[PDB]
Structures are given as structure tokens and as C-alpha cells.
Amino acid sequence: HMTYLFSATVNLGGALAPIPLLGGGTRVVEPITGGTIYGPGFNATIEGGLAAPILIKENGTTSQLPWVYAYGHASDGSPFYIEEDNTRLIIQVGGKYADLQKMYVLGQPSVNEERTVATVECWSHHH
Numbered sequence: 198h199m200t201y202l203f204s205a206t207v208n209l210g211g212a213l214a215p216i217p218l219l220g221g222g223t224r225v226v227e228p229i230t231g232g233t234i235y236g237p238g239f240n241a242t243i244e245g246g247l248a249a250p251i252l253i254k255e256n257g258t259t260s261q262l263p264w265v266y267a268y269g270h271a272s273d274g275s276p277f278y279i280e281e282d283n284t285r286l287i288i289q290v291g292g293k294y295a296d297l298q299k300m301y302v303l304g305q306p307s308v309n310e311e312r313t314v315a316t317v318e319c320w321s322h323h324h
């Protein structure tokens with residue numbers, strides 16, 4: 198029914214100040230400077246990317262809509278690209294981890310208070 202795949206530790210660079218959006222939300226751009234993915238289902242080095250969450254208040258409560266784009270190489274050398282939008286993660290990689298493309302991958306990300314490190318635990322749902 199559900200299988201643990203990997204965790205990720207993501208190093209975040211200097212974020213840009215919030216961008217005011219029409220309607221009252223804000224977009225916060227957080228460059229990714231590196232990080233590591235480790236687990237039974239995926240092992241890789243994060244080389245770059247960005248998070249671009251949107252913060253929007255609806256009915257008095259701020260919801261954060263995550264958007265994340267990251268890339269690197271897997272432990273076998275294969276380039277990968279991950280897009281995040283619980284949240285769904287779409288993993289595009291060939292080589293030994295290629296079967297991740299066939300999986301419905303969900304992630305639970307958290308960011309430390311100072312917003313220098315994001316961590317996420319990811320698992321596949323056998324729908």
C-alpha cells in the first residue's frame with residue numbers, strides 16, 4: 198500500500214524578498230545550492246534548482262503552495278530532475294532508479310526556522 202523511498206536534505210541559499218502578487222499573495226524565491234537524497238529507493242546528489250512557494254491567505258489562514266524544481270545526479274551517475282507541486286513529487290531519472298517515473302510519489306517537506314535547510318520524506322502510494 199505505501200513504501201518509503203527516500204529522504205532529502207536540501208541546502209537553501211539567500212532567498213529573495215517576497216514578491217507581491219495581484220490579489221494579495223506573495224511569491225518567495227529560494228535558490229537551492231545543494232543537498233543529498235538518501236534511502237532504499239533513491240540516492241542522489243542535488244546540484245541546483247529553486248523553490249518558489251506561493252503564500253496566499255484564504256479565510257484568515259495562510260496556505261503555502263509549494264513549487265520546487267531541482268536537479269542533480271543519482272548515485273549511478275544518471276542526471277535527474279524533480280518537480281514538486283502532502284505534495285506530489287515527479288522524479289525523472291534513467292539508469293538504476295528509472296522505475297521512479299512509474300510511481301506516484303508524495304513528500305512531506307519541512308524547513309528549519311532560519312530557512313537554510315529543507316528536509317522531506319518521500320514515499321510511493323500504490324494508489
Ligand SMILES: C/C=C(C)/C=C/C=C(\C)c1cc(O)cc(=O)o1
Pocket residue numbers: 205207227229243247248250263264265267279281286304306308315317
Ligand atoms: C526531492 C525533494 C526536494 C528536493 C524538495 C525540496 C523542497 C523545498 C526546497 C521546499 C521549500 C519550501 O519553502 C517549501 C517546500 O515545500 O519545499
